[PDB]
Each structure stands twice: as C-alpha cells, then as structure tokens.
Amino acid sequence: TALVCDNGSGLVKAGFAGDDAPRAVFPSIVGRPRKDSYVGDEAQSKRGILTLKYPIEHGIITNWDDMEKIWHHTFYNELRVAPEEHPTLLTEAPLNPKANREKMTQIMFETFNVPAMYVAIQAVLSLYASGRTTGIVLDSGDGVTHNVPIYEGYALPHAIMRLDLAGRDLTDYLMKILTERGYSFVTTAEREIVRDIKEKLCYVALDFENEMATAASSSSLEKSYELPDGQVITIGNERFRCPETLFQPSFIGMESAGIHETTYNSIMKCDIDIRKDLYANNVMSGGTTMYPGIADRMQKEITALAPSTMKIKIIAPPERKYSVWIGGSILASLSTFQQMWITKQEYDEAGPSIVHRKCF
C-alpha cells in the first residue's frame, strides 16, 4: 500500500493509492500561541488565539520546519501509518525549483525513513485522472493558478503559464464586495463564512454585463444564505462578480491576463502540431475551478480566441477538487509504476539529486 500525499497551499490531501478519494483533507497550516504548535485542524479549530503560518506559498514549500510538522501530522495523526512501511508519492507545483524537490527527497528518506518515494507534477496527475496523457490542464487552487500543457506525460516547461491569483484571493474579494454591500465580515470566523458562501453560491456568468443587467433589474439571481447563528442574508450579483476575477484580474488590481488568455497563450507557446490535441483536451482541476458555469464560459472565451475551425473541448470532472490526488492514487497503484519509485537503496547511492533522474 503506497501513500499519496498532495500538498497544496491551502489544503493537504492524503490517503492510500488505489482508493478513490483521500482519507484526510485538512488545512496546510501550523499554529503558535498569539502547547507548542498546532498542526492542521486543531490549529483551525483554534484559529482565534493562535497565529497561523502556511508552509506552502503559491504552491511552493517555503517553511521546511513547519512542512515537516505537516508531514509528521499526515503520517501519524491522519493516516495512522509508520512511514517506514509505505512508499510515498508526493506532488509538486509546476516549475518547482530543483533545490526544493531535492530537499523533499532528503527529508522523506532521512527524516521519515520511507522505503521509497516519488514526486509528480500536480497538473500531470490531474490529466491522468481524466484518462489522458496528452492535454492542457488549468489547475487553480488556493494560492496559485497554472496552465500546464502536457505531451505524453511530460509537461512542456517553456509553455507553462501562471496566474498569481486563486481561491484565497477570491475569498478576500467576496469579503470586500459583501462589505461594500453593507455586511460585516471581519473576524476569522466570519471569513470562514465568506469562504462557505463562495463555495456554495458563487458561479461564473456567461457574459458579465448581461448578468449585471439581470441582477440590477430583478431579484431572479438573488440567493438566501443562513448564517450559523440563524440570520438570513441575501447574495446578489456578488455571486458572479467574485469568480469573474479569474477572467478579469483587474477587479483586484492585477494587470495579468485572465485564465482564458493564459490558456490560449500557453497553447500558442507549444509546437503548432500538438495545438489541435491541446484545444480538444482542456482539463480543469483544483477547487477554484468548481464554480458552476466555468466550463461554458471558458468554451465561449477560447472559441473567441482560437481559429474558427478548431474543435474546443473543456473537460471539468465532478471530482476535480481532488483530481490531483486521484491521479496520484491511480499512478501509484499501476503495476508498471513499480520500477519508477525512488528506493532508499537508490537514495543511498546517489543522494537527493536522484529525483532529477527519476522524477520528470
């Protein structure tokens, strides 16, 4: 039984290879008093008198001491396994620096004493989860958004696009525009309410101006939301104004291109002879791609940018907030993957840089 640990900026996804979903999902946080430290949910359930730190920023591990606490908590507290008895598949962001993946390997072998391990690119695993080995993935989570074009299991690094806005920014923006409406969301508990409103009632409009006009002249787009204590508030055009930022980042002051444009730019940076297969295999993954309407809007926007004869297909699997993990669960449970593991024996001979030769 190999393990699969998908470490995100906001959420850890962990479980056992061969399972259809992670056993444990919890915030990628470590907390200290404003005991010594609180990791994951016990830090979350104490979000009021501790200072929280995120060891992963924009998909990149930046605090290795707290990351070790996350990995320890994952193994012992969540999965209830001894890491010495299980090969462990880990995930990394696209373009993860060489020094980072080497220290990932070193900590797994030297600190947790895993018998074997592997590091896979997150977006590649999401493509695998949809049964594909060629395509272009839009991966949008809590801290970062990427376009990753992939040819037969290999990400094409020169064509990878990035957008430094994701779910946390959208939560903050929904907070901002709900307060401009007249509500108050200032406490940490109230921020969690805004995140829940975002995940439950927000959607992507097919056309922003048409939708704004509908919300201005009728109540047909308004939704009731019951707060935990009992009050009912009304959410109107904030429902689609918040995720509109993915297509128009200027709503939060970013002049970067929106996700339809990073997708098109990514495909255009690939060799012309694979662009046809990329256009027909656009796979959406990550929690921030869960908005209703996002596939239909991406289809409309990419169609407007691509040649008129190009077949455009957006694939948005219902499980895509766990697509990376599911792809790792598939990969690590395949018989042909057995020889791909980095073994502790291999690590002792070559050292941490073995990950460059075995994981690509």
């Binding site: 399972d19 979903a21 989860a129 449970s333």
Partner: peptide
C-alpha cells in the same frame, strides 16, 4: 518498447476513478 510507453498506455486504460476502492473522506476543508 519503452517502460514509459507502457505506463502511458496503462493510464489511458485504467478506468479512472471507477476502478478505485470506494473510501470515505474525513474532509475538513
């Protein structure tokens, strides 16, 4: 003729999430 070729074929014919054991998620997102 390559191990990578066989792995890619195995990914395409894996059945996806369909053939994975149904488990329960203790999801605290």
């Amino acid at each position: 003729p390559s191990l990578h070729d066989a792995l890619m074929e195995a990914i395409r014919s894996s059945g996806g999430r369909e053939r994975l054991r149904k488990v329960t998620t203790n999801d605290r997102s």
